[model samples]
Target: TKRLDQIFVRPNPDTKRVPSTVFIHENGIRFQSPLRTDSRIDILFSNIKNLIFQSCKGELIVVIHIHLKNPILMGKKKIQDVQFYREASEDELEQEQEERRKRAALDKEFKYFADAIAEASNGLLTVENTFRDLGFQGVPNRSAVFCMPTTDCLVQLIEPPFLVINLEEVEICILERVQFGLKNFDMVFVYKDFNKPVTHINTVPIESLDFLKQWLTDMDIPYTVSTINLNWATIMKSLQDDP
Candidate 1:
């Protein structure tokens, strides 16, 4: 077992993160909470189908963010995403060079520690920073995050209620109300599951329409452009529930 003391964990959204001593075991991973000796996180690596190892060094917060696969437990509510983070910069009043130097150090730190995590879990999976460029952004549950272009599926490994739409499973992507006169446009992705709610993202910029189509084209996913707006939220609801 390996113990990492600097890692921090957020028990729930309502509460801020508490420093946790993380333990990596062959059978499972655990978080030792200082607030209570018994209170901690314990999960087998196999239980995690997907997770993200990301470090934000853009200032304000230098965090090592980790994503947990859904339906995972917390308290009171279902909290899917968890943190394996480092807070932020220490001092103020610095030149650009000094700020640069400080941020660079954190980058190596995250890289080094993250590598250890992957090595320990080498018996199973590997980790990397995952993201998509010019991808559809929306609050699946919370925060505007880009879709992850993984080995197979286009998944959103953001907060709760993550969206996983396989490229092979995509029936079509519909672009609606995209025009010069319009402030924004809408996109709807229909999947193979007839009962599943169509993934809808609204108010995307009109000019980005070409690249949006280009992305779908390269993926070989069929799409159609439309002048009319479909009542997607209600239409998709019919496909979802209220039966």
Candidate 2:
């Protein structure tokens, strides 16, 4: 019921450029527009997964996109969700200057609201963060991925919080040089597990070889580095021939 924050509406494909107020509540967020009869959009904090922000048209406008964990039903349709824009006036220079101010103010307000949402969700949802953009690329499984600066390594998967691995058991780190795509190599940690034999800890794309090597060294972990190239194929063929 309490309005934490609000933002003016801008015209989009679905909605008209009318005077609308987006209200952020304690439990959810609602967008109410006076022009349309069916204007209120309520989104619960639990449903939100990610909140992304991008500046378009050379910083003239900002767009806020919300990624929901579950799709919300609205008029038998589901939609995912922007900043502000002012109407053009006869005085071109004045209007442009005013818009510039509004854009700057809107950007700051959007950031504040995003932070609030993340806090309210208790870290269930993230704001302005991406795993791919941060140089960590891999399909997340039950295993925990550890990298430099713990914040950058937290990979959320469809598993319980308690299913985490102990860092002390990390035995050997393996760095495999990949020859195919943008990511030149991949790294995995081998844990000390007699029952499992070879426990696959977690595999992540190696953004910097030196960084990974240095981190392993600093952590006092034993690691073996290897490259897989045409020579590797030749070695495999020789082994097959001998057998």
The whole-model C-alpha lDDT of candidate 2 against the native structure comes to: 0.49
TM-score, structure 1 vs. true: 0.70
Q: Provide the TM-score for each candidate, comma-separated.
A: 0.70, 0.41
Model 1: number of backbone collisions: 0
- Any runs in candidate 1 off by more than 4 Å, and if so which? 1-4, 32-38, 57-70, 90-94, 132-171, 233-243
Alpha carbon lDDT of each predicted model:
0.62, 0.49
Q: Give the C-alpha miss distance for residue 154 in model 1, angstroms.
A: 5.1
Candidate 2 has which clashing residue pairs, if any?
none
lDDT of 2 by residue, 1-243 (tens): 334333444224465445555566777677753236655777888887555543322333444546465766553455433222222223999988887777776666665666766676666666653223233334335454322222222222222121122335666766666444645565555555533233232345555666667756766778776664224345435545574
Candidate 2 Cα misplacement greater than 4 A, ranges: 1-15, 33-35, 56-59, 81-102, 129-243
lDDT of 1 by residue, 1-243 (tens): 556677666544445556667777876578754334336667666665544454443334444444454555555445555556665553465676786776777666766665666677765646555444545554444455555554445665444455556677788899888766886787788886757668876666666678778878988999988888887677667766654
Locate the minimum summed-lDDT window of 10 residues in model 1. 57-66
